[PDB]
Amino acid sequence: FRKMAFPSGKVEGCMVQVTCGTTTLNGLWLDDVVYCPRHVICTSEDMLNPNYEDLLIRKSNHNFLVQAGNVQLRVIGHSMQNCVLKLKVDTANPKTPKYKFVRIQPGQTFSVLACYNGSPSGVYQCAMRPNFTIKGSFLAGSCGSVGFNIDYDCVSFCYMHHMELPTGVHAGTDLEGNFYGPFVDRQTAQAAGTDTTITVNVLAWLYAAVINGDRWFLNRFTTTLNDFNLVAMKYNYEPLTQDHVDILGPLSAQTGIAVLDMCASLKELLQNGMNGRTILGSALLEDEFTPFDVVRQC
Amino acid sequence: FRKMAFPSGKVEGCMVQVTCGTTTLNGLWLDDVVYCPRHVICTSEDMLNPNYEDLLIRKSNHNFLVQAGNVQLRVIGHSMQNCVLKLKVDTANPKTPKYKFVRIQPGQTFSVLACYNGSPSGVYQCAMRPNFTIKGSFLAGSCGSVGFNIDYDCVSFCYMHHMELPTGVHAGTDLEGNFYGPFVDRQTAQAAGTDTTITVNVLAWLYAAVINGDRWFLNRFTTTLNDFNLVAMKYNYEPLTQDHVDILGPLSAQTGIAVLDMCASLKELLQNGMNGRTILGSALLEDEFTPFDVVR
Numbered sequence: 001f002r003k004m005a006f007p008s009g010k011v012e013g014c015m016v017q018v019t020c021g022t023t024t025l026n027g028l029w030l031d032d033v034v035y036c037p038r039h040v041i042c043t044s045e046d047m048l049n050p051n052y053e054d055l056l057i058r059k060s061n062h063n064f065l066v067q068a069g070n071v072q073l074r075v076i077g078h079s080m081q082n083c084v085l086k087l088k089v090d091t092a093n094p095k096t097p098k099y100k101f102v103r104i105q106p107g108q109t110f111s112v113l114a115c116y117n118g119s120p121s122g123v124y125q126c127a128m129r130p131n132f133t134i135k136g137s138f139l140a141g142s143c144g145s146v147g148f149n150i151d152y153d154c155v156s157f158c159y160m161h162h163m164e165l166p167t168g169v170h171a172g173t174d175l176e177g178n179f180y181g182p183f184v185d186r187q188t189a190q191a192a193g194t195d196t197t198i199t200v201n202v203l204a205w206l207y208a209a210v211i212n213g214d215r216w217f218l219n220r221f222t223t224t225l226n227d228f229n230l231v232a233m234k235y236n237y238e239p240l241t242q243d244h245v246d247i248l249g250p251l252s253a254q255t256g257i258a259v260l261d262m263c264a265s266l267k268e269l270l271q272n273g274m275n276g277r278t279i280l281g282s283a284l285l286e287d288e289f290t291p292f293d294v295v296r297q298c
Numbered sequence: 299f300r301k302m303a304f305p306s307g308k309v310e311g312c313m314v315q316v317t318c319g320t321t322t323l324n325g326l327w328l329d330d331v332v333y334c335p336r337h338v339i340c341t342s343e344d345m346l347n348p349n350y351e352d353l354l355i356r357k358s359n360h361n362f363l364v365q366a367g368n369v370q371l372r373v374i375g376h377s378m379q380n381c382v383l384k385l386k387v388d389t390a391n392p393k394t395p396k397y398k399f400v401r402i403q404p405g406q407t408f409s410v411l412a413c414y415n416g417s418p419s420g421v422y423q424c425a426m427r428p429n430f431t432i433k434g435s436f437l438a439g440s441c442g443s444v445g446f447n448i449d450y451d452c453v454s455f456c457y458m459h460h461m462e463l464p465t466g467v468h469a470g471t472d473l474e475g476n477f478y479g480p481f482v483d484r485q486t487a488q489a490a491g492t493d494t495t496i497t498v499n500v501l502a503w504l505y506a507a508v509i510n511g512d513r514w515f516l517n518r519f520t521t522t523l524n525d526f527n528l529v530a531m532k533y534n535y536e537p538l539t540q541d542h543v544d545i546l547g548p549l550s551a552q553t554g555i556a557v558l559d560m561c562a563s564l565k566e567l568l569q570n571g572m573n574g575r576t577i578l579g580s581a582l583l584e585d586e587f588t589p590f591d592v593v594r
């Protein structure tokens with residue numbers, strides 16, 4: 001059962017390079033606006049304790065160099081929305097897809113198009129961790145790379161990369177500039193919180209194992225949401241809510257395994273291991289498929 | 299350290315749908331040729347014992363319906379090269395990238411754009427397994443989906459999907475229609491041989507780990523090449539050849555760890571497991587990064 005990323009072509013045609021003085025990063029060119037992290041206007045010195053409103057007042061359109069491949073785009077206005085810089089440019093991107101800006105919840109998945117100085121390098125499938133970071137392999141100079149989902153030709157942009165945290169994970173904002181997680185765009189001391197496993201996604205993945213004919217972990221037992229969540233506590237799993245149960249409702253109706261029956265399976269796997277067995281050819285429990293991801297690919 | 303697929307846009311613009319009778323699958327539209335699996339001309343029954351020369355001689359150009367989005371392409375010639383059908387069409391694809399066809403070897407990696415009925419659905423990064431199969435995620439009807447690498451904006455096409463094997467793995471051809479492995483485009487009892495781990499790829503990834511500052515799995519031992527292979531083959535690891543040792547030369551020089559010293563570390567990892575630790579971002583020994591991948 002392979003993780004898959006969305007086809008990235010619609011996003012590839014929006015990636016540009018944004019340069020302000022000595023700093024170069026990636027920007028997103030949609031219609032006549034280029035979106036990028038506001039810390040592009042900061043000198044390493046500024047990063048220490050920036051006043052972004054002031055730093056931007058001292059900037060002019062001529063301070064921004066935007067390049068779309070071989071072509072310079074002329075900036076004709078600049079503004080900020082939260083942590084995102086918005087550069088109005090002279091030309092509308094003729095490759096702008098149908099798109100929306102959306103904010104996702106921890107545990108949800110998206111694809112990231114990793115870019116180096118405006119040029120797309122690779123694409124991978126992510127989950128937003130419960131601690132609001134992304135475990136990403138990242139190029140040098142990937143700031144401003146974006147995360148997205150695609151639904152019927154409409155690109156839903158959900159993430160823009162802003163920073164690497166000391167533990168090697170990544171932190172960013174939605175496309176309206178609101179941070180995911182308790183992080184700020186400053187060179188200060190900050191660290192990811194202790195992470196947990198995304199329980200509703202593990203359950204979804206066990207449903208995928210059953211749809212694919214791996215059934216050995218199924219047992220006769222059921223459990224209670226409360227009894228399960230105390231077991232979840234001890235193994236650093238996110239608490240499971242009635243919301244999560246209803247979301248798994250389709251897979252429970254499709255496979256015949258009630259969610260609390262599957263929870264009894266997961267509780268046993270957590271307490272006793274896999275006894276040398278494998279689930280979808282894996283010895284570890286996967287938590288970066290959502291229930292939606294599983295219904296989609298199955 | 300995440301497995302990344304190549305950006306798929308250059309291939310998305312080449313995917314089309316090919317229909318012959320009641321059979322529909324994916325085709326690849328490059329210049330004025332559409333490439334697709336020749337079993338598009340078969341019904342399910344034909345698959346037991348297809349005679350492709352007989353099935354194809356009975357077809358004319360208008361028996362092939364090619365759709366590129368909302369536009370029908372007119373087929374104006376056809377021919378078979380090994381196991382791929384080549385449909386000549388009216389129109390050169392305006393979105394044809396710089397491209398080439400390359401036949402890869404087991405252990406090599408590539409991205410696969412998985413498609414249903416001509417529309418791209420997802421992209422993932424692959425290794426050609428030592429048993430010449432792909433551990434894919436095939437949608438129903440993903441036949442004709444292609445595998446590729448992209449190097450300096452030139453797309454190297456190396457794989458086209460033809461068959462599902464009974465174990466859930468996938469078999470296919472290069473773009474000249476020659477199957478990878480002993481498989482055929484016929485519904486026989488063929489099965490993937492025992493899969494092995496790509497040893498040279500695990501060792502390259504261990505060097506990646508050391509370059510990025512993980513050293514906990516190193517030890518003070520070395521090994522002969524032959525002692526290493528005697529042990530590794532007991533874990534279903536591929537034998538390591540002197541070519542592989544040479545290939546790891548650069549990463550050895552970069553890290554100051556002799557290749558056979560890294561082999562000793564692998565031997566101990568296989569003996570001990572990870573003891574709850576991780577190497578790059580993983581709790582398993584990763585074998586789908588090549589030595590070429592790691593230098594990048």
Ligand SMILES: O=C(/C=C\c1ccc(O)c(O)c1)O[C@H](Cc1ccc(O)c(O)c1)C(=O)O
Pocket residue numbers: 320321322337340341342343345441460461462463484485
């Ligand atoms: O796809 C077909 C071909 C034709 C077909 C075409 C229209 C039908 O209504 C029908 O029932 C069958 O059959 C397959 C060939 C094939 C396609 C995709 C695979 O993944 C595979 O393993 C084999 C088979 O039986 O081996």
